[PDB]
């Protein structure tokens, strides 16, 4: 007969926040904020949110609580030809889960290695360090060399990641068993949180969504007490209005807020599917989004206080210390900064554990959307038991992550994360944004919102759904396709054919939507206008 619901408004309410907040919120926003105008970057970051992020978040969050269907079956009730979207996302997920969990595997390998009284990345006297390794509490006057490296950089480079054993994308095998065990433990800890459905995913979230704020608070006070921490805050908030004249920083902010809210994937759809019908969507979306951003904002301080202390301990010019723009900012710089502090074991454990808890809920939701859709598309053909399908997805994701668990894995993380998944999710999100507003009709949508909330949404939101949001995604997609960024990681420049590979992985994800449009269009009899009429009209 019917489906299930939420145990309490909060669990989903948090749960969606647990989905939105992640690692990107922690390290990605502070960097892009600092190098693009500093505090001035706060101006275009909000404009791209209010006009572009919020309407997509709310528009995505409403349909899920209205139709109460998955990512696939909701198209059968709107535009069946676009039903392939629901499949595409699935395929997309399979790629996403291939690298998103390996980062948590790194953080976990760091966590289990943070139970020793003396932290590994502090000394150079190890079995993975080289002759270049030079640490502190050593001879003074030391001068850095082009070939010299830090014990933290060695620890990340040559131990956990073990990237020195690979020459790049060409030769990256073999596979590391340690990170395999870690990612197995993680694939187990996400299993016991989803297998019981939305009951546990709203209960486990309680721990995974609240801990990062406590950790950020501790690291915030700690970083605030650190000497010379005002340099990172200064560099982090120093107004550079000239940056606003560049047409690039606006695109950067747009992509940033779009990715942070992560609408148009069906996760919000699935989370909204299990909720009250007369329940509000406006306040929910608004509050959640404002948290995701604010959280990023304070995370900026948490990062740049410690990086300010790091620049103070070195020689200023914070940008120098924050030259790297990736996990190295957390696994090397921030880690090495933690190692030189009292109770370093504590601040390390809470940090890596913070990372794990930061990714876990996002994984919960990420898989949750796909599982919900598939079960809703194949009902009771599926849903006979949930642990069977969930496990079947988890294992497949594990075998799909073996490519990432290799020695040359981070390369594949960059390649898949930037050249494959990102334009594809933006693309399918564009197809959704166009499909809901121009095919199903924005008027009928406002009528549905008028049914649920009791009142029709304002002109401000309608005008955003009609033209502002599709052009919002359009600007990002066009900007990327017109000029794909040159990839670089760990003193290694990517080959020219890399973009060929990523696109190849990108295009091969949505192959189901045009061929599915052709499927319906080749299945439905009569004239093409009649088939398209049955493909545009919702199901009698």
């Amino acid at each position, epitope marked *: 007969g019917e489906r299930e619901t939420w145990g309490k408004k909060v669990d989903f309410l948090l749960s969606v926040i647990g989905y939105a907040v992640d690692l990107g919120n922690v390290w990605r926003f502070p960097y892009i904020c600092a190098q693009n105008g500093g505090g001035a970057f706060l101006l275009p970051y909000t404009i791209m949110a209010i006009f572009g992020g919020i309407p997509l978040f709310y528009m995505e969050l409403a349909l899920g609580q209205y139709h109460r269907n998955g990512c696939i079956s909701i198209w059968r009730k709107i535009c069946p030809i676009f039903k392939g979207i629901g499949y595409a996302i699935c395929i997309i997920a399979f790629y996403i889960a291939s690298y998103y969990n390996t980062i948590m595997a790194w953080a976990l390998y760091y966590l289990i290695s943070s139970f020793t009284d003396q932290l590994p990345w502090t000394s150079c006297k190890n079995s993975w360090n080289t002759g270049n390794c030079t640490n502190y509490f050593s001879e003074d006057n030391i001068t850095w060399t082009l*070939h010299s490296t830090s014990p933290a950089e060695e620890f990340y480079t040559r131990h956990v990641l073990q990237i020195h054993r690979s020459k790049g994308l060409q030769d990256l095998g073999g596979i590391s068993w340690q990170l395999a065990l870690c990612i197995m433990l993680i694939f187990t800890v996400i299993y016991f949180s989803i297998w019981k459905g939305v009951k546990t995913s709203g209960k486990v979230v309680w721990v995974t969504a609240t801990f990062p704020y406590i950790a950020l608070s501790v690291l915030l006070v700690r970083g605030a007490t650190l000497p010379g921490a005002w340099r990172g805050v200064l560099f982090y908030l120093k107004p550079n209005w000239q940056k606003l004249l560049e047409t690039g920083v606006w695109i950067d902010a747009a992509a940033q807020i779009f990715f942070s809210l992560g609408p148009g994937f069906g996760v919000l759809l699935a989370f909204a599917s299990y909720n009250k019908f007369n329940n509000n969507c406006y306040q929910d979306a608004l509050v959640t989004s404002v948290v995701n951003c604010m959280t990023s904002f304070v995370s900026g301080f948490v990062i740049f206080t410690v990086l300010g202390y790091m620049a103070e301990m070195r020689n200023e010019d914070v*940008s*120098e210390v924050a030259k790297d723009a990736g996990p190295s900012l957390l696994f090397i710089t921030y880690a090495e900064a933690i190692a030189n502090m009292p109770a370093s074991t504590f601040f390390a454990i809470i940090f890596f554990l913070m990372l794990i808890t930061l990714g876990l809920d996002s994984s919960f939701a990420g898989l949750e959307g796909v599982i919900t859709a598939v079960l809703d598309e194949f009902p009771h053909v599926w849903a006979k038991r949930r642990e069977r399908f969930v496990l079947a997805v988890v294992i497949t994701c594990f075998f799909g992550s073996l490519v990432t668990l290799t020695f040359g894995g981070a390369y594949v993380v960059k390649l898949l994360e930037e050249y494959a998944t990102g334009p594809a999710v933006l693309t399918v999100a564009l197809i959704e944004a166009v499909a809901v507003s121009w095919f199903y009709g924005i008027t009928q949508f406002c009528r549905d919102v008028k049914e649920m909330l009791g009142f029709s949404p304002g002109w401000f939101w309608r005008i955003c759904w009609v033209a502002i949001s599709p052009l919002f995604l359009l600007f990002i997609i066009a900007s990327f396709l017109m000029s794909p960024p040159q990839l670089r990681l760990f003193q290694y420049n990517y080959p020219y054919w890399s973009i060929i590979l990523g696109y190849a992985i990108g295009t091969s994800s949505f192959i189901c939507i045009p061929t599915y449009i052709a499927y319906r269009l080749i299945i439905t009899p009569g004239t093409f206008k009649e088939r398209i009429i049955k493909s545009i009209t919702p199901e009698t």
Partner: antibody
Amino acid sequence: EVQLQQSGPELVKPGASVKISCKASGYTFTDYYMNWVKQSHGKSLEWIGNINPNNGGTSYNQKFKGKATLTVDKSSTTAYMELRSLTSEDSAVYYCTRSPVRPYYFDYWGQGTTLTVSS
Amino acid sequence: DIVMTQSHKFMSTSVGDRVSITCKASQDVSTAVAWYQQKPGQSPKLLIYSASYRYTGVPDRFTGSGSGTDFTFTISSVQAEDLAVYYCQQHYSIPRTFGGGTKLEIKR
């Protein structure tokens, strides 16, 4: 015995180009950044830019972007700086100095190169 | 960028007198300031790095001090061969900038 031997004086007509060399010795060439400093007659020192000998990692100044071109040769451990669109302002003394990664000081300098841009 | 300002273009001193040159920066620099010596007709020679530290092959009569924006280069015993132009240079932010230069003339 760290020695940096540059090239001799160069007299060139305005609008043309000029290349200056920099032979390094007495140290591991692939260990340190190679830099070039412009000094006008009676004026102060002016950091043009550096280059990483390992891969030719160049890093220029905004004031010299599109004015100077730095190259390097590991086979003979020699750095090069090329100047195009020469004017009377370019008539100055140029140095090539070695520098580590951190702290970024200029420990060893070349003897200098007197450039004269005139017809 | 960063502007290293040297107010005194010229300074007079006698053999054996205590002389000190000041270096003013744009923003805070903390530790990183280097002092170079350039004799007339020669290339600049590194004397001081990181505010106070001395480089190898430098006499004990050359000292450095300061922490922030204002820095001080101190010579206790001025010799006849200490006649040169002294520069101060920051080394934290890109690009690296120098100072005006103080031509230390000797009074006798």
